[PDB]
Amino acid sequence: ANHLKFIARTVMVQEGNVEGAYRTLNRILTMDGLIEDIKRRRYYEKPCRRRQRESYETCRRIYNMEMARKINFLMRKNRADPWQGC
Amino acid sequence: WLIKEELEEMLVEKLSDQDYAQFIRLLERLSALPCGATEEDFVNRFRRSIPXXXXXXXXXXXXXXXXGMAFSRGEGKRKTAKAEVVVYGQGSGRIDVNGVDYLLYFPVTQDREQLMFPLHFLDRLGKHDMTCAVSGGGRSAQAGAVRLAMARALCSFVTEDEVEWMRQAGLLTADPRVRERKKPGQEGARRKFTWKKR
Ligand SMILES: [Mg+2]
Ligand SMILES: [Mg+2]
Ligand SMILES: [Mg+2]
């Protein structure tokens, strides 16, 4: 409100395609976590009920990180197998 | 390739699907490379050969002694109704049914259309002269039997090529469709007595 307007969260559509530029802006906000925050902040969420969220999120992030790594590590051996029908 | 049962017979050994699959897979690997002599013999052990036969069996024509003229005699059978149709190769267009004319014996237009089908297909409509004997069932069944019998007796006077057409037109194939027996405790073989939830 004290900041200069139109500098923030602004995309300018190129070659007149609107839908593309909107997708772009959406990708911005969702990349920064603002959509999850708006949606979060429609109602309240109590501090306890918040650390639960945090911890469940962070556990899940750890799991998915690890499992991802493991998958991409074992990726090589997806290759068609040499020894078949030994 | 062998079935699973045939490899089971060859080795005198119970098998698993997986195992069979594994092996056949391996034989594909074998065929995949340059094929030696004993290599080919080896895979021949596990080879079998199968027959396939498709042609509508072609009756040689029959030249009558009386006029010295050629005819062909077909037999159709549909749904309680059999028909026999003798087709003479030089016609006036005359078509006689059980000793009466085909218009009188099929007052239902639909039937006459069914009859018209093979001849209109082979463009022979005036060219041929048919005598006909049909029995069993009701009118549509009869007209259809004559359809089959006629289209069968028409493949002597047609070209070897038009035959596969009449097949793909479905003229020479019988109608497998027939009445289904009522079942006891039911109504109509399918229809059931009205069912009560309470
Ligand atoms: Mg204001
Ligand atoms: Mg966060
Ligand atoms: Mg009924």
**Rounded to 5 degrees, what are φ and ψ at B63?**
-90, 120
d(CA A22, CA B63) in angstroms, rounded, equals: 85
Q: Is the minimum CB–CB distance between B48 and chain A shorter than 8 Å?
A: no
Q: Under 8 Å CB-to-CB from B185, ≥6 apart: which residues? A: B193
Q: Is B63 exposed, middle or buried (0-12, 13-18, 19+ CB in 10 A)?
A: exposed
Query: Which residue of chain A is at minimal alpha-carbon distance from B25?
Result: A85
Distance in Å, CA A33 to ligand 2 centroid: 8
Q: Under 8 Å CB-to-CB from B23, ≥6 apart: which residues? A: A85, B7
Residue B158 and residue B122 in contact, taking contact as beta carbons nearer than 8 Å: yes
**Rounded to 5 degrees, what are φ and ψ at B75?**
-130, 110
Residue B173 and residue B89 in contact, taking contact as beta carbons nearer than 8 Å: no
End-to-end CA distance of chain A: 74
Query: Which residue of chain B is at minimal alpha-carbon distance from A86?
Result: B26
Q: Is the minimum CB–CB distance between B26 and chain A shorter than 8 Å?
A: yes
Q: Under 8 Å CB-to-CB from B69, ≥6 apart: which residues? A: B63, B88, B89, B90
The DSSP 8-state label assigned to residue A44 in this structure reads -
d(CA B34, CA B36) in angstroms, rounded, equals: 7
B25 interaction partners in chain A (CB closer than 8 Å): 84-85
